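Model the whole thing, not chain by chain.
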Amino acid sequence: EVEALEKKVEALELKVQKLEKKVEALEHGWDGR
Amino acid sequence: EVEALEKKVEALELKVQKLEKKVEALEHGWDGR
Amino acid sequence: EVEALEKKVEALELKVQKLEKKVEALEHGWDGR
């Protein structure tokens, strides 16, 4: 279970960091977005 | 603790998937967004 | 490991809640966004 949680948490961390980047681009109008 | 973590992780997974959908719609201008 | 997971999960929860707020603002055009 723990090793399974660890793997899912790290997938979520990647996903969330990609979302933060995309959301900041939308919020700031980076590159016409 | 582990069962508690498992439950919170799965809530985060739902949330993140809904955020990805919304962000992709904003990024692609789906349906006028 | 468990205490480590707990800490990362709670960071993700903060992050996701901030993302939901920002995304809702973009989706609703709150405050010109």
